[PDB]
Each structure stands twice: as structure tokens, then as C-alpha cells.
Amino acid sequence: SKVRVIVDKDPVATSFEKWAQPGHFSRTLAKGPKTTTWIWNLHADAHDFDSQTSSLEDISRKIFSAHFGQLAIIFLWVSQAYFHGARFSNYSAWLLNPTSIKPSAQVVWPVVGQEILNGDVGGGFSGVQITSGVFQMWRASGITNETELYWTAMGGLMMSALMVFAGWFHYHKAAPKLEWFQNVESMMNHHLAGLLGLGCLSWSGHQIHISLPINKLLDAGVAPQEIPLPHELLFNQDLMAQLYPSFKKGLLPFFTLNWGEYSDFLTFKGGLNPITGSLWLSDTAHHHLALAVLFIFAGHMYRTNWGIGHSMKEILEAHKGPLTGEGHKGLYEILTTSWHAQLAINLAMMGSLSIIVAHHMYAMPPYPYIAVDYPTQLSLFTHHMWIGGFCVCGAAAHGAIFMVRDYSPVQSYNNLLDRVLRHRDAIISHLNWVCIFLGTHSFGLYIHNDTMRALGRPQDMFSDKAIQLQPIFAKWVQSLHTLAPGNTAPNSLATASYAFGGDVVAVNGKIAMMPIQLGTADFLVHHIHAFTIHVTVLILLKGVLFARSSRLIPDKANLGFRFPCDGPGRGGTCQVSAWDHIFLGLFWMYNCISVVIFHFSWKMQSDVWGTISEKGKITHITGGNFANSALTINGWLRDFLWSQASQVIQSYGSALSAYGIIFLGAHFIWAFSLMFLFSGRGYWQELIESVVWAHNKLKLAPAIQPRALSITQGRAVGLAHYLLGGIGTTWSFFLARIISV
Amino acid sequence: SHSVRVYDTCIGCTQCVRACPCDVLEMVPWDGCKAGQIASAPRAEDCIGCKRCETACPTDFLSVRVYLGSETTRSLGLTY
Amino acid sequence: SEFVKPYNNDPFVGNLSTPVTTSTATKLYLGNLPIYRKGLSPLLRGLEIGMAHGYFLIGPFYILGPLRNSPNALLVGLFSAFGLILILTLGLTIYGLASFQGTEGGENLESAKGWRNFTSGFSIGAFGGASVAYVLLDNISFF
Amino acid sequence: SASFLPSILTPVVTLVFPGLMFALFFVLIEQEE
Amino acid sequence: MSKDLLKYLSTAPVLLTAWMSLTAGMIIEIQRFFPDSLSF
Amino acid sequence: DVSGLTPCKDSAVFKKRLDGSVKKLQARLANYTEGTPAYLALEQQIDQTKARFAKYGDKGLLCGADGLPHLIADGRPDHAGEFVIPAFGFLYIAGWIGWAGRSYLQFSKKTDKPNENEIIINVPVALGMMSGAFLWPLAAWKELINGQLLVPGDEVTVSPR
Amino acid sequence: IERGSKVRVLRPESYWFQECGSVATIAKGGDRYPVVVRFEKVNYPGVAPNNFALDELGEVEAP
Amino acid sequence: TSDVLNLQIPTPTFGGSTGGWLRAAEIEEKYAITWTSKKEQIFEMPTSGAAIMQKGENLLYLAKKEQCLALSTQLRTLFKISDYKIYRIFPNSEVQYLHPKDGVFPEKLNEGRIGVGNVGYSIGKNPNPVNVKFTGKNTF
Numbered sequence A: 001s002k003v004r005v006i007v008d009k010d011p012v013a014t015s016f017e018k019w020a021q022p023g024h025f026s027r028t029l030a031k032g033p034k035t036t037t038w039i040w041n042l043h044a045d046a047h048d049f050d051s052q053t054s055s056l057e058d059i060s061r062k063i064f065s066a067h068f069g070q071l072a073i074i075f076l077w078v079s080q081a082y083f084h085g086a087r088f089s090n091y092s093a094w095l096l097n098p099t100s101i102k103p104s105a106q107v108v109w110p111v112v113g114q115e116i117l118n119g120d121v122g123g124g125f126s127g128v129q130i131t132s133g134v135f136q137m138w139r140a141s142g143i144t145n146e147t148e149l150y151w152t153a154m155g156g157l158m159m160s161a162l163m164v165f166a167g168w169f170h171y172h173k174a175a176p177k178l179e180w181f182q183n184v185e186s187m188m189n190h191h192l193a194g195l196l197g198l199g200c201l202s203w204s205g206h207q208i209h210i211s212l213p214i215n216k217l218l219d220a221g222v223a224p225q226e227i228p229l230p231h232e233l234l235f236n237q238d239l240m241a242q243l244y245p246s247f248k249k250g251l252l253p254f255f256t257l258n259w260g261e262y263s264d265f266l267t268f269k270g271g272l273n274p275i276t277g278s279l280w281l282s283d284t285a286h287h288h289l290a291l292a293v294l295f296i297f298a299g300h301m302y303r304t305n306w307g308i309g310h311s312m313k314e315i316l317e318a319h320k321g322p323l324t325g326e327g328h329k330g331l332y333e334i335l336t337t338s339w340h341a342q343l344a345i346n347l348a349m350m351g352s353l354s355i356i357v358a359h360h361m362y363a364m365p366p367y368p369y370i371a372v373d374y375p376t377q378l379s380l381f382t383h384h385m386w387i388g389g390f391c392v393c394g395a396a397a398h399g400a401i402f403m404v405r406d407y408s409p410v411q412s413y414n415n416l417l418d419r420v421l422r423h424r425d426a427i428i429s430h431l432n433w434v435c436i437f438l439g440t441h442s443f444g445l446y447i448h449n450d451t452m453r454a455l456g457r458p459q460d461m462f463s464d465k466a467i468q469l470q471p472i473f474a475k476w477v478q479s480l481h482t483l484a485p486g487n488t489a490p491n492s493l494a495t496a497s498y499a500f501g502g503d504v505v506a507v508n509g510k511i512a513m514m515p516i517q518l519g520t521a522d523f524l525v526h527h528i529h530a531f532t533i534h535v536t537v538l539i540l541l542k543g544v545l546f547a548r549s550s551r552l553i554p555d556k557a558n559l560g561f562r563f564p565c566d567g568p569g570r571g572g573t574c575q576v577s578a579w580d581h582i583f584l585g586l587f588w589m590y591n592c593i594s595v596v597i598f599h600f601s602w603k604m605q606s607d608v609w610g611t612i613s614e615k616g617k618i619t620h621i622t623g624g625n626f627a628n629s630a631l632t633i634n635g636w637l638r639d640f641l642w643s644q645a646s647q648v649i650q651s652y653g654s655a656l657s658a659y660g661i662i663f664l665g666a667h668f669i670w671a672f673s674l675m676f677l678f679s680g681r682g683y684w685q686e687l688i689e690s691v692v693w694a695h696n697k698l699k700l701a702p703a704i705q706p707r708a709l710s711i712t713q714g715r716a717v718g719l720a721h722y723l724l725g726g727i728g729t730t731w732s733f734f735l736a737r738i739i740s741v
Numbered sequence B: 001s002h003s004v005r006v007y008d009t010c011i012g013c014t015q016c017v018r019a020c021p022c023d024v025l026e027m028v029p030w031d032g033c034k035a036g037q038i039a040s041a042p043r044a045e046d047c048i049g050c051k052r053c054e055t056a057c058p059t060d061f062l063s064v065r066v067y068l069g070s071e072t073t074r075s076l077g078l079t080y
Numbered sequence C: 001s002e003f004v005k006p007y008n009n010d011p012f013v014g015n016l017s018t019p020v021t022t023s024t025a026t027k028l029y030l031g032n033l034p035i036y037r038k039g040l041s042p043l044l045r046g047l048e049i050g051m052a053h054g055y056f057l058i059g060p061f062y063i064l065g066p067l068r069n070s071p072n073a074l075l076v077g078l079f080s081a082f083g084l085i086l087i088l089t090l091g092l093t094i095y096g097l098a099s100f101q102g103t104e105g106g107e108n109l110e111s112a113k114g115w116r117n118f119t120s121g122f123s124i125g126a127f128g129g130a131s132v133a134y135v136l137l138d139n140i141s142f143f
Numbered sequence D: 001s002a003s004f005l006p007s008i009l010t011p012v013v014t015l016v017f018p019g020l021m022f023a024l025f026f027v028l029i030e031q032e033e
Numbered sequence E: 001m002s003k004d005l006l007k008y009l010s011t012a013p014v015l016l017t018a019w020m021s022l023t024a025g026m027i028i029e030i031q032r033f034f035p036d037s038l039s040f
Numbered sequence F: 001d002v003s004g005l006t007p008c009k010d011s012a013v014f015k016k017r018l019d020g021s022v023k024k025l026q027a028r029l030a031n032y033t034e035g036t037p038a039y040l041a042l043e044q045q046i047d048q049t050k051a052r053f054a055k056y057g058d059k060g061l062l063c064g065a066d067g068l069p070h071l072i073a074d075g076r077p078d079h080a081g082e083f084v085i086p087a088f089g090f091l092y093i094a095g096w097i098g099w100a101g102r103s104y105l106q107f108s109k110k111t112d113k114p115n116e117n118e119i120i121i122n123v124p125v126a127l128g129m130m131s132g133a134f135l136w137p138l139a140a141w142k143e144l145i146n147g148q149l150l151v152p153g154d155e156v157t158v159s160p161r
Numbered sequence G: 001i002e003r004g005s006k007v008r009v010l011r012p013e014s015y016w017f018q019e020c021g022s023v024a025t026i027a028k029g030g031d032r033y034p035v036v037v038r039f040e041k042v043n044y045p046g047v048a049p050n051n052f053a054l055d056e057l058g059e060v061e062a063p
Numbered sequence H: 001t002s003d004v005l006n007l008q009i010p011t012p013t014f015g016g017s018t019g020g021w022l023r024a025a026e027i028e029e030k031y032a033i034t035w036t037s038k039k040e041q042i043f044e045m046p047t048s049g050a051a052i053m054q055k056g057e058n059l060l061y062l063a064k065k066e067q068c069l070a071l072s073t074q075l076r077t078l079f080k081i082s083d084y085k086i087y088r089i090f091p092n093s094e095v096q097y098l099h100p101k102d103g104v105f106p107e108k109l110n111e112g113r114i115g116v117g118n119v120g121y122s123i124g125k126n127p128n129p130v131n132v133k134f135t136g137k138n139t140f
């Protein structure tokens, strides 16, 4: 038995002693503050466990306990949504009419005149409108009662207390040894089967036994208070057979492999449910079954205590070719002896997954009546875009940290990491050329369109009435997807999503999903997206590759991961660290995500969202102006920003006035960022000296000497303020626009 | 080329010589301090101006001072 | 095997002997172009570069120019190609003036006489190639 | 007839003059001792 | 309580948060009892 | 009166703003059933609006042509309910805060670990100075006369100039 | 001045100009700056002491 | 030592990197470092990558003095080699000896060195820049 549980007993005593000794974790900060830099260094080095201890075992134990604390915070955050739905919401009135009642689960206290924020959301309720989509998520689970929300909140509180106790227990009572964490094959098998496949299996079971009958009865017109309770549906084959006439046969067709008898509640019809404008829940349960079987099957791959299985060291070391030398040899030790490498991979995967979630949940609305809730769709898309962008920047940050700290040349000789590091100039040069080519083309077409329209030459533009740039490949892929049911998806009733072409889906006048037509403006903005992604990749990859050394500075690894410069020498070595590369790439991530969400908002308001009247008359929100106005920068400025800021600037005196307040405040914070971003430390230090003179004159000098913020801290403060102001301005603008139309 | 000067507040604690990445500084005998040595800059044409010596000086307002001046292919750190 | 090795058997030069840099196909291609072909005077190198470049340069002005939907499209494209060729010739002359000063001359390209011969060949070749592609474009229905 | 002077002087000045000045300035930059 | 938990509660961020919460509470209750005051 | 302004109790635009403010909430009130806490909250808002406007009329504020109260920071005695009396109140409170901070600074300087007394506050002593700073205009004057408030000037550090 | 004296620094380019410090050691030899003064406030590099000459210290308190 | 370099010293086995010297090393200035090893081991190159150092004597060409001194710092703070020599090769095959000049390291005192750039007063007693106006000289 090689895979075993080895655990130390009572390693660290639980005491409130180092709570009163701040900065105890590091050697330098524990000696007490002399200046007002020890405070910021205390805050910056709190989670840098690799610089506190040289033992990987203690670092891993700290990571595990911190994971438990994070999971406790997330459980409390789930419990807040369930409790606010139970006690502070209009979820019942929304259930009785989920097309005219606006969801709201957040009520303000009247003290200062802020009771105007309690708007008329419908159903005899006053509160702030909710764009989280938790109401549709609860309706997709069959939570028609307000008691089940309360008990879900109580269970979430219990689970959060459990995670707090587990975090204390695994650091102070039973902390696992280093050999426990390095069982990556066992961890991989257990995650792939028990977490993913068993979660899919249990959720498919809940779906089949609770959400399918309750949502079927809800779509049939039965009021929520006359629907059988989920425990009355769980153990009633007669009632389920009344709803789905396949439970008469019971579990026997499952074991006899006659799975075709279960096609009443396990379908592959595709498309959207016409009643709710969402995916069929039978398709969802079938999807979760397929995923559960696939994940449990995949969790049987890696070797554990028994002789069957794979070793991941042998898989990696067998993959090598002529052009790559030793191949993947030595990556197993890298990924089993370093946490920063695992962050660099997992953050990239999680950011890309969040972006995939954003692209998939708008064209395929998975919750009932979420497609006709336009604020929910816009908020979810923009949210997951921003989360994905932040995580994909953090992946490059931790790759740089690994390259500075945990890299070893003796371990990684002539493998893929060494070969990548030995030709980094070619990579950075060619990616530089690609960035310049994409930028010149994609942006100069916009500038050329601006010039032609300003010179009174619309016939010389890059438009559909002019020189055309038709995205022929995307149109071909759309035509392939539209013809998939029957030909390349023979057991399919409808298309995967209606964005690829097909039929307009309408739920009580509003458009749920209709085909999205691609023109030359779509070609132009997709090339803009590719260019912005490429420049962000250029900055982050240059930071990762040149983290150890460069032609300018041969010993950059000896200076650390983050450091301000190496003096004014060599003409100037400002922002040479990989940290400054992450700092510069975060701005370009912000630019890319802002352009992506602007494209989404304008295209969906212009060509998808709207109303339908008699004889299929489609009237969109903005009037189909994306095709001719998204070709010029002036068209963007006038028809998107100026035209859609009318809702956020006229929100004063109404229930949306908080959005205007946050609009102004986020503009203020964004402008406040440039103070740190443009200026430098020495001026502020001299001004602080001038203030310290007056303080010394009035016997007011603090013993902790006041200092200006450090150069790295000044850059970090400016970047954080810039991101907060930008995301706040876009947040308030989107929410105030899309709530009011 | 930059110009490097060492003033008589030197204590001969050698940190500037160790901090130098371009072999500009060296220790010469002296009699004005307890250590019996003072820093010197005999190879100021190899100075790049990164001021690592000025970060390493412990004396109040550093004794070794680097003044940025003319730029050559060595003081710019150009490999091309 | 190992198809990426140090460039020209020196492991410390800033280049690699990849299948792109040191293949026999790439050597045959980039050892037989006019700027690299053996036994060529600089004037002939410039001429052979210029005719291809002029043919090229009259390419995009005729199709995408402001007067593309005009009966005088090909003439305007030819004149625009002539202007761009003149600008490139002026750039070549000023590059030769700034780069090759106090040189011994000869059949080497990196000299005053060699670069003057190269620029003269490029200019006459570029004007000729633009004219030839004008003639072929005016009678494109022949093919 | 003074209706020719814009179309004569504006291209000559604005295009030809700074191009020759850029070429001359570049040559004067790169001449050495 | 303890001789060392009180020392943690005596730290600058905990005391700042507690005192700002007390000040905000006092001002909010004053606004609740004496609202919309422009003049004295 | 002052600057051509009229009293808010004698201004028609102020009464028009009153009517508009109550009519907006009355129009918001019509979609709620009576006895529901939303209805009670809205009528409480209406009563609060009426009380606020009546108070602004009664306090003697001056409204302009827009019907909004205009504060006179001149220093006239009949407008001392404006700036001057809150000025005295804030000056007292700000001097209280400054003197409490200065007294605790002196105490923390006179101890053995001045740095640790500023990140970890000596709460009993801090409360002592904080409550004893109520007589700051007298204590500060006594320290100024005694010569303990101000450093002579040759003892504070200065830049070379 | 003696060891343990409280002195005021008169060097204009020093961080502790017109500030009080404590004499630590007076070296008896050919040193140009023999007196060692230790201060309670660190400078920008964080260095507490410095070597000073006998004419750069104004003296405040005897040992 | 003197201005002599053995051109036939074996080099560390390196797979070739895109960090080596460019065209202005055979034209303007080139640097080399030679050291003595006791065993065959792997060291990190200052121009990225990893190379195996040969047991015995090694020779390595770099483009600037900073790279040679960074490699020497690596050969000191890590596995102990303290007899490295840094040279400067001119395009006319002329070599000049730079590091360990007088034979000993610069941090250790050596009798026979002359102080260059020493100033006989404190830094706060420099002349004002008005007193050097229209003279060409400076207040350093």
C-alpha cells in the first residue's frame, strides 16, 4: 500500500499569542515597525508562504487550511443568497408571474432618504432589482416554496461552520505530511470520479426526481401551492408514471440495458423549451448522466495501491520528438514539487472555463425565463468575462513566480522548459510582429472608415454597401450547425442553439433567442478581439519568459520576482521585473474584456433582444443599427456610449439613482488612479518631508516614521484603482441601461 | 561614460565593491578610518550607472556617488 | 534524433540551426535569389529585384484605389506605382548616401559604386515592371 | 489666374518640400567626422 | 478574553474599524432621530 | 432680503416643489394595497417630506428663484443657524480630536517602545487622554504660554537650503 | 564630548541635521570622523548610526 | 595574469541559444571568461538555458562584461569556483585582461593600488554650479 494516510498529530498549538504579534510569519517584519512601510509589507507578505518557511510540508498544510477557510467563505456566500430569497424577496410573486414581476431580494433601510431605492419591482414588493439570476436557478431546481430556501440557507451556514472546523483541525490537530499531498494520481482519480462524476450523478438524480416533475407541472399551468412536495414526488411511482409513463417499468430497464425505454425523461431533443425559452430539463438530466458516466470512467486511469492504472511520470517521459529534445521529462517533478506551477495551470484553465461559461450561457439559456430577463443575461456574461480575464492574468503571474523561484537548471536540462527558454527572442519577436500586423489592420480599417465617412465618401468604406469583408468561415460553420439535426445529429430534433440560425423563440412577446447574423462589422470586431488577446499574450508571455534573465539584465533572477528597477543605468531599467509585466498586462486584459462586453451588449441589443407583435414583426431595442454604425469609432462613440448613457445620467430621482451615483464615483476613482500611475515616489517623499517639518514643529512626529508608498506599491495602488473605477463605471452603465429598457 | 567619486566619509566596509556588477570599484589602502581602506573607481569607463553601490553604502548620505553623464556602448549595456 | 543544433557549430552565437534556418531547401532558395545569387553584378541584382517589385506595386493601386470604378483606373494605378517607385528610389539613394561614405567601390554591394549601380538597376527595373504589368493588365482578356 | 495657385503651391510645398527636407536632414544626421 | 486576545483587539485596524463603526452608528442614529437638518 | 432672496415660507416655487414631491410619492402609492408595510413606508415617506418642507419653511431659510434654500455664510446674527454655529461646533470637535491624538503621542513617545504603542494602542491611557481632551482650548493655551507646545525651530530637522 | 553624551548634529547633508543622538564610541586615532552617534530614528536606508566629526556635534547633555 | 588567452580551451556543452552575441561582437567588442572545474555539472547560462560545464578548463564567449560578471557571481555563490578570468577580445584578435586584475579580488585589499576618484572632503562641500558656469568643468 503505497498510497496511504500519514498525518502529524498536534503540530501547532492553538493560541491567541501570535495574533498580538503582527508580522510574526517573516523574519524581517517580526522585529517591529520603524517606518510606515512595515504595514504595507505586512499586508503584501501575508499569503507568501514560500518566503516564510523553507519546508514544503508546512507550506502545503497552510495551503490546505486556507482552502478550507475559503470554502467556508463561499458557503456563507451561498447561504446569503438563499436567506435573502427566503426572507427579503418576492420569489413567490415572481413564481406566480415570471414575466412581469422583476426579481428583487435586497431591501434598504430608510434613514437618510435612501428609501427611494426601494423601487416598484411588482408583486406588492419594494426593493432593489436583482440581476444575479438566482430566482431562475431556484425555479430550475423546483424550490417553489419559501421554506426550502430558508433551510438551504441554514444548511449552508452549517456547512460553513464545518469548513471552519476542518480548517482549524487540519492545521492544529491533524496536519497531513508531504507524502500525502504528493499522491497526485490518487488525488486525480478521487477528484475525477468522486467529485465530478458523483456530483453529476447526484445532481442528475435530483433533477430526474424533483425538477423534471415540478417544472413540468409549473409549465402545465399548475400554481406552485398546489404542486406536490418533492418528498411526495420522490417515493411515488404512480405520480411520476402519470407525468412520465416510464416509471412503471422501474429500474429494470436500466439493468437489462434497455435504456431506450427511458426516453420519456432522458431526451436529446435540443433547441429551447417554448414555454420558458430555456433548455429542456430532460436534456439537462441526460447531459448530467452522460457526464457522470464519462467522469467516473475517466477516474479509473491512474495507478494507486493496486497494480492497475497509469503513472503520470511514464506518460510524460514517453512523449518526446526530434525537434524537442528530451520532451516532457522533468515536468512531473516540477508539478509535484511546486505549488506556483499548479496555480499557473489551474488559473489559466479556470479563466478559460469562465469565459467558456460566458459564451455558452447566453446562446443556450439553461434556466427557465432567464432568456427574457435581459439584465440577468448581460450581468452574467460580463461577470464571467471579467472573472476569466483576472484568472488568466493570474496564471501568467504565477508562471513568472515559478520561473523566478522554483526553477532549477539541473532538473530541467534540455526538456521543453529549457528549449522554450533557449529561443525566447524568436517567440517574442514573432508575437510582436503578429500584434503589430493585427493592430494596424483591425484598427486602421476603423480609422479608414472614419476618414471615408468624414470626407463624404461612404462608397470607399469597408462596409456591406462598399468593399466587403464577409466572415465566410463563420457563416459556413453556422450553416453547418443549422443543418446538423438529421444529417450529422440524426437523433436530434432541433439545433444546439438558435444563434447558428433557425427559428425565433419568443416568450410572451419578448425574444428569447433568435439567429445572430454576422457581417463586416462582426469580422472587424472579432479581429479587434484577436488583436487585444494577442497583445495581452505578448506582455504576459514576455514577462514569464524574461523573468530570470534578459539581454538588458543578465541576473534578473537574483533581484526577485517583484522589484522596482535596477537603477537609471543602461539608459534606464524601469519596470524590468515580471511583476511589472503582469501589471502592464492587466491593463490590456481590461481593454480586451471591455471591448468584448461592449460588442456583446451592442450586438445583443441591436440584433437579438426586442419584442414580437402580430404577423411576426420584430422590433429590437436599438433598431438594428449595429450593422452600419459599428464600422467607425465615431459610430461606436455616438450610438453606443452617448446613446446608451441616457439611462444612467437621467436615473436621478428614481429607483436607479444609485447607478448614477456609482457612475460618478467610479469616474472619480478611475481618475484618482492616474495620480499614482503617472507620478513617482521621490516627489511624494519630499512633500511628506515638508509636512513632517510642521508636525515636528508642533511636537506631532509619529515614532513610526511616515514614508511614501514604495514604487511597486504605488504601481499596484494605481492599477487597482484603475481597474475598480473602470469596472464600476461599466457595471453601473450596463445595469442602469439594461434595467430601464 | 559616467563619473564615480568616493568621498572621505568612507569607512571601508567593502559593500560597494561587492555590489558592483561591472568591476568598477576596488579597495585601496588608506589611513582615515579604522578599517584602513577607502573605495576607489579606477575603471569608470565600465560604469553602467545602475547605482547598486549607492544602495549598499551604510554611511549617512552615501560616500560613493555616481553621476550620470555621457552614454557609450558600455554604459548603455548594449549587447548589439 | 535532434534537428535543432547550434548554428554553424558555435553554441554561443545568437542563432539556431533549425530546419528553417539551415535546410538545404532554404539555402537553395536564399542562395539563388538576385540579392544572393553568385556571379551577379549589383546592377543586375537591382534590375531583377526591381521588375518583380514594380509588377507587385502596380498590383494594389489599380484594384483598390480611389478611382477603381473609373475608366481611368489602370492609368491612375500606373501613375501611383510610378510615384511609389520614385519614393523608394529616393529612399535607396539617401540610404546609400548615409551608409556608404569614403568607400573604395567595386562589385561589392556594400560600397558607393555598388549601391549606386544597385539603385539604378532597381529604378529602371521597377519602372519597366510597372509598365509591363500595365500592358498585361490592359489586355487581360487575351488569357 | 489665381485659381491655379492652390493646386500648384499646396502639393509642391506640402509634399515635395518636407520630403526633400527629411532626406536632407537624415543625410546631415548620419554624416560623420 | 485573555491577556493576549485583548492585545490583539488593541491593534490599529481592529480599533479603527470598531471606532469608525461606532461613529457611523452614532451619526446614523442621529439622522434617524433628527433628520433633514440644514440649519442649527 | 439679502441678495434678492425671499423667505422659503413666502415662496411659491418652494410650495410647488412640495406639491411635486408629495405627488410623486402619491402616484407611487396607488399600486399598493392598504395595511401592507410598503403602503405604510410610502405614507411615512410622504409625512417625512411634509415635515421636512414645513421645517425648512419655519427655520427662516431664504430660497432663491429656483425654490431651493440658500445658505448665507456672511456672519449675520439672524443667519447664525447657518455656517457660524456649526463652525464653532466643528472647531471644538476637531480640536478635541487633535488634542487627544497629540496627548497620546506624547505618552507613547515617553515610553520604552514608542513604535509598539502606535500599532497596538494602550487603550486605558488612550481613553484617558481621549476623555481629558474636552478642555483642549485651555490646555493648549497653557502649553503655549509655558513654551511646551512649540519646538524652538533650531531643533527640528530641515533640508539643506 | 564623551561616550554616552547627548549631542545635536550640525552636518547639513545628514538625515539627522539639528537632531539629537547619543555618542557611542570616540575613536582615538587618525580617523577623520571618529565619533559614533546612534539615533532613535532610522533614515531612508534604515541605518540608525553614523560617524561624525568633533566639529559637527553641538552637545546637549553630559553623561 | 597577462594579455594571453588560449583559444583552444574546451567550451561547455551547450545546445545553442537565442541569447548569444550578435553581429557587434565580431565588429566592435567581445568578452570571454575562463575558469577551472573539478567535476562535470550543470550551470545556468546568463543568456538563458542550461549548459554542462566540463571537468577541467572551460571557455565561454559573452557579449558584455555584465554577463561575464554575473556568470562569475554564479560560479562563486553556488559551487565554489574562485579562479575565473574575464578577458576582452577585440576584432583584431587583441585580448585584454580585466577581472582579477592585480591577481586578487577587488574586495580584498592589495598593496600597490592607487586610489582613483577619491575626494578629500564630504559630499556636502561640493561647489555650487554657478561657480562652474561657462567653464565646461563640473562640481564633482
Ligand code: CLA
Pocket (backbone or CB within 6 Å): A063, A064, A067, A068, A071, A180, A181, A183, A184, A186, A187, A190, A191, A193, A194, A195
Ligand atoms: C471522493 C473523494 C474526494 C472528494 C469528494 C474531494 C473533494 C474536494 N477536495 Mg479532495 N482529496 C481526496 C479526495 C476527495 N476530495 C483525496 C483522496 C486526496 C488526497 C490525495 C485529496 C486531497 C485534496 C487537497 C490537497 C485539496 C482537496 C480539495 C478538495 C475540494 C476542492 C474544492 C471544490 O471543488 O469545492 C467543491 C465543494 C464541495 C463539493 C462542497 C462539499 C465539501 C465536502 C467536504 C465534499 C465531500 C462531502 C461528502 C463526502 C459527500 C456526502 C454525500 C451525502 C450528502 C450523501 C473538494 C471539496 C482542496 C480544497 O478545497 O481543500 C479544502 C485541496 O486543497 N483535496
Ligand code: CLA
Pocket (backbone or CB within 6 Å): A043, A044, A045, A046, A047, A048, A049, A347, A390, A391, A392, A393, A394, A395, A397, A401, A561, A562, A579, A582, A586, A720
Ligand atoms: C487562485 C487565486 C490566487 C491565489 C491563491 C494567489 C496567491 C498568491 N498571489 Mg496572486 N494573483 C491572482 C490569483 C491568486 N493569487 C490573480 C488572479 C492575479 C492577477 C490580478 C494575481 C496577481 C499576483 C501578483 C501580481 C502577485 C501575486 C502574489 C501572490 C502571493 C502572495 C499574495 C499575498 O500575500 O497577497 C495578500 C493579499 C492582499 C494584499 C489582498 C489584496 C486586496 C486587493 C488588491 C483589493 C481587492 C479589492 C476588492 C476586490 C474590491 C474592493 C471594493 C472597494 C469599494 C472597497 C500568493 C501566493 C504576489 C507574490 O509575491 O507572489 C509570490 C505578487 O506579487 N499574485
Ligand code: CLA
Pocket (backbone or CB within 6 Å): A432, A433, A435, A436, A437, A438, A439, A440, A443, A444, A447, A535, A538, A539, A584, A587, A588
Ligand atoms: C489609444 C492609445 C493607445 C494606442 C494607439 C496604443 C498603441 C500600441 N500599443 Mg499601447 N498602451 C496604451 C495605449 C495605447 N497603445 C496604454 C494606455 C498603455 C499602458 C498600460 C499601453 C501599454 C502597451 C504595452 C505594454 C504594449 C503596447 C503595445 C502597443 C502597440 C501594439 C502594436 C500595434 O498594433 O501597433 C500598430 C499601431 C496601432 C495599433 C495604432 C495606430 C494605428 C493606425 C491608425 C494605423 C497605422 C498608421 C500608420 C502606422 C501611420 C500612418 C500615418 C502616418 C504616416 C502619419 C501599439 C503601438 C505593444 C507593443 O508595442 O508591442 C507590439 C506592447 O507590448 N502598449
Ligand code: CLA
Pocket (backbone or CB within 6 Å): A440, A441, A443, A444, A445, A447, A448, A451, A460, A461, C057, C060, C061, C064, C065, C066, C067
Ligand atoms: C492598415 C489599415 C488600412 C488598410 C488596409 C487600408 C486600405 C486602403 N486604403 Mg486606407 N487609411 C488607413 C488605414 C488603412 N487603409 C488609415 C489609418 C487612414 C487615415 C490616415 C487611411 C486613409 C486613406 C485614404 C485617404 C485613402 C485610403 C485608401 C485605401 C485603399 C487603397 C490604398 C492603396 O492601394 O494603398 C496602396 C497599397 C499597397 C501598396 C499594398 C501594400 C500591402 C501589400 C498587399 C502587403 C503584402 C505583404 C505580403 C503578403 C507579404 C508576404 C510576402 C511573401 C509571399 C513572400 C485601400 C482599400 C484610398 C481609397 O479611396 O480607398 C478606396 C484613399 O484615397 N486610405
Ligand code: CLA
Pocket (backbone or CB within 6 Å): D005, D006, D007, D009, D010, D011, D013, D014
Ligand atoms: C505663416 C503664415 C502662413 C501660413 C500658416 C499659410 C498657410 C497656407 N498657405 Mg499661405 N501665404 C502666406 C503666409 C502663410 N500661409 C503669405 C505671407 C503669403 C504671401 C506670399 C502666402 C501666399 C499663399 C498662396 C499664394 C497660397 C498659400 C496657400 C496656403 C495653404 C497651403 C500651404 C501652402 O502651399 O503654402 C504655400 C505658401 C507659400 C509658398 C508662401 C510662403 C508662406 C510664408 C511666407 C512662410 C511662413 C513660414 C512660417 C513662419 C513657418 C516657419 C517654419 C516652417 C519652415 C516650418 C495654407 C493654408 C495656398 C492656398 O491657398 O491653398 C488653399 C496658395 O495657393 N499661401
Ligand code: CLA
Pocket (backbone or CB within 6 Å): A690, A691, A694, A695, A698, A700, F097, F098, F099, F100, F101, F102, F104, F121, F126, F127, F129, F130
Ligand atoms: C491626531 C493626530 C494629528 C494631528 C493633531 C494633526 C495635525 C495637523 N496636520 Mg495631520 N495627519 C495625521 C494626524 C494628525 N495631524 C495623520 C494620521 C495623517 C495621515 C493621513 C496626517 C496627514 C496630514 C497632511 C497630509 C497634512 C497634515 C496637516 C496638519 C496640520 C494642519 C491641520 C490639518 O490639515 O489637518 C488635516 C488632517 C488630516 C487630513 C489627517 C486626519 C487623519 C485623522 C482623522 C487624524 C488622526 C487621529 C488619530 C488616529 C487619533 C488617535 C489617537 C488616540 C489613540 C488617542 C496640523 C498640524 C497639514 C499641514 O502640514 O499643515 C500645516 C497637511 O498638509 N496632516
Ligand SMILES: CC1=C(/C=C/C(C)=C/C=C/C(C)=C/C=C/C=C(C)/C=C/C=C(C)/C=C/C2=C(C)CCCC2(C)C)C(C)(C)CCC1
Pocket (backbone or CB within 6 Å): A078, A079, A152, A153, A154, A155, A156, A159, A198, A201, A202
Ligand atoms: C443546495 C445546497 C446544499 C444541499 C446539498 C444537497 C442536498 C446535497 C445532496 C447530495 C446527495 C443526496 C448526494 C447523493 C449521492 C448519491 C450517490 C452518489 C449514489 C451513488 C450510487 C451508486 C454509485 C450506486 C452504485 C451501484 C451500482 C449502480 C451497481 C453496483 C451496486 C451499487 C448499488 C453500489 C447545502 C445545504 C449543503 C449547502 C447550500 C447548497
Ligand SMILES: CC1=C(/C=C/C(C)=C/C=C/C(C)=C\C=C\C=C(C)\C=C\C=C(C)\C=C\C2=C(C)CCCC2(C)C)C(C)(C)CCC1
Pocket (backbone or CB within 6 Å): A698, F073, F074, F075, F084, F094, F095, F096, F097, F098, F099, F102, F136, F140
Ligand atoms: C469672521 C468670519 C469669517 C472669517 C474667518 C477668518 C478670516 C478666519 C481667519 C482665521 C485665521 C487667519 C487663522 C490663523 C491661524 C494661525 C495659526 C498659527 C493657527 C494655528 C493653530 C494651531 C497651531 C492648532 C494647534 C492644535 C490645537 C491647539 C488643537 C488641535 C491640535 C493642534 C496641535 C493641531 C467668514 C467670512 C469665513 C465667515 C463668517 C465668520
Ligand SMILES: CC1=C(C/C=C(\C)CCC[C@H](C)CCC[C@H](C)CCCC(C)C)C(=O)c2ccccc2C1=O
Pocket (backbone or CB within 6 Å): A675, A676, A677, A679, A680, A681, A684, A707, A708, A709, A710, A711, A713, A714, A715
Ligand atoms: C499620492 C501618492 C503617494 C502618497 C500616498 C500615501 C502616503 C498613502 C497614504 C495612505 C493613507 C494614510 C491610507 C488612508 C487614506 C485616508 C487616511 C483615508 C481616506 C478614506 C476615504 C475613503 C475617505 C505615494 O507614496 C506614491 C508612491 C509611488 C507612486 C505614486 C504615489 C502617489 O501618487
